[PDB]
Amino acid sequence: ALPVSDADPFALDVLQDPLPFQANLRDAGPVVYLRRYDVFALGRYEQVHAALTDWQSFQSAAGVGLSNFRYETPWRPPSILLEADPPHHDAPRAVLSKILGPRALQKLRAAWIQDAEALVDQLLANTTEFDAVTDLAAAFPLRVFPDAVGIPDAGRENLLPYGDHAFNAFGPANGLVEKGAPRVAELSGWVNAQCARDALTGDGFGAQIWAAADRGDITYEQAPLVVRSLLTAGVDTTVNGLAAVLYAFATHPDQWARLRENRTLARTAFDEAVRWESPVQTFFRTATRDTEIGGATIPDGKKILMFLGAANRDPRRWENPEVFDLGRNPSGHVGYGMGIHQCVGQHVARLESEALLTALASRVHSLEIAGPVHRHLNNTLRSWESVPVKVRLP
Ligand code: HEM
Ligand SMILES: CCc1ccc(C(=O)O)cc1
């Protein structure tokens, strides 16, 4: 009965430009069987939302990549947040929810704002033409987030590769994964080292996680894996979200002026970029029982592929979805997911954006694309390689 398709969402040509595919997915029906992978794809907002929230029907503990941990060996000990269901999910989630929550981040705001202003000021002192990825979007998270976690300086060059491999590894064992598999032992080796109590400053998120373990909120065994979650999820996502927002502003002069005309728009600017780009494209779930969704039965034990990018551009939910518009209300986009696993780092992402955008807006009159943009292909993370920009100063 279902629409059925030979489309490969992880083919390089789709990864380079996934918008065609998303439209085809959404157009085919609520539920498309991807024969290539024996999973059920969902591309419309309504079903993606329903699948995300229904953790009882659609579990995470069997893996939220293609790989089914029922049968297949994980490349790493699975995340005790992302790949855990209730009740195991609950305690580590609650720890991060508190540590990364708005109240907690309040104390970092002025420092991050300040660090962003310094970054931008020093960049613009040297040059008004530069790569928005390497000089801003990549630079700024690396300058603030590792320090805030409180890991040592040694080995920080592993953060982006580690993150990229983890997101690739949610995909099939295709070239993007298999070309990374030599390096994982040394990648996994480093990150585990950063997660130990003795490797971490006694100030940052890491120390706070360990302090939560002292109170018994989590165990000393969970504590380093909780730190690990931050070091997997917390860097590459924000780099690519920041690249997207910068790309959006550089191609939308009116939206840029609107930001400049009201600095409180940063928050909603970043959230709209998250909707519009959807840096995290896809996640899987595993059906725990035969389940009806969008008219289709998902057999017990089979995986659903949720297309967050496609749901975020679904015209059933969004007016003129292709447009980047800070006048839009993007609240309810599924770019951070939805329900019990909804991104716990969203306050962290929004603050980085607020800091960087405020700093940029203070010093840049207008912003243009200065040269060809280039994507970095990844199975699950829409990644920006280069975004040459030129700025005009006041
Ligand atoms: C633009 C930035 C970000 C995007 C687009 C993003 C996206 C996501 C999405 C889609 C999920 C849901 C996973 C699922 O449903 O299976 C998620 C979960 C998560 N994110 Fe984020 N994220 C971002 C930034 C961050 C940051 C800065 C951190 C940490 C500081 C972080 C940590 C996490 C964690 C630990 C989870 C798992 C939570 C759970 O399973 O309960 N993310 N993120
Ligand atoms: C942002 C998607 C994501 C969420 C959590 C993890 C992790 O816990 O390692 C890794 C990736």
Numbering used by the authors: 7 to 400
Sentences from the paper on this structure:
Similar to the substrate-bound structures of CYP199A2 and CYP1994, all three structures were in a closed conformation, with the F and G helices occluding the substrate access channel.
PbdA also catalyzed the hydroxylation and dehydrogenation of p-ethylbenzoate even though RHA1 did not grow on this compound. PbdA bound p-EB with close to the same affinity as p-MBA, its preferred substrate. Moreover, the apparent kcat/KM of PbdAB for p-EB was within 50% that for p-MBA. Finally, we analyzed the products of p-EB oxidation by RHA1 resting cells induced to express the PbdAB system. Both desaturation and hydroxylation products were detected, along with acetyl and epoxide derivatives presumably produced through secondary oxidation of the desaturation product. Despite the efficient oxidation of p-EB by PbdAB, RHA1 did not grow on this compound. PbdAB also efficiently catalyzed the hydroxylation and desaturation of p-EB, as reported in CYP199A4 (21). It is therefore likely that the high affinity and specificity of PbdA for p-EB reflect its chemical similarity to p-MBA and this is not a physiologically relevant reaction.
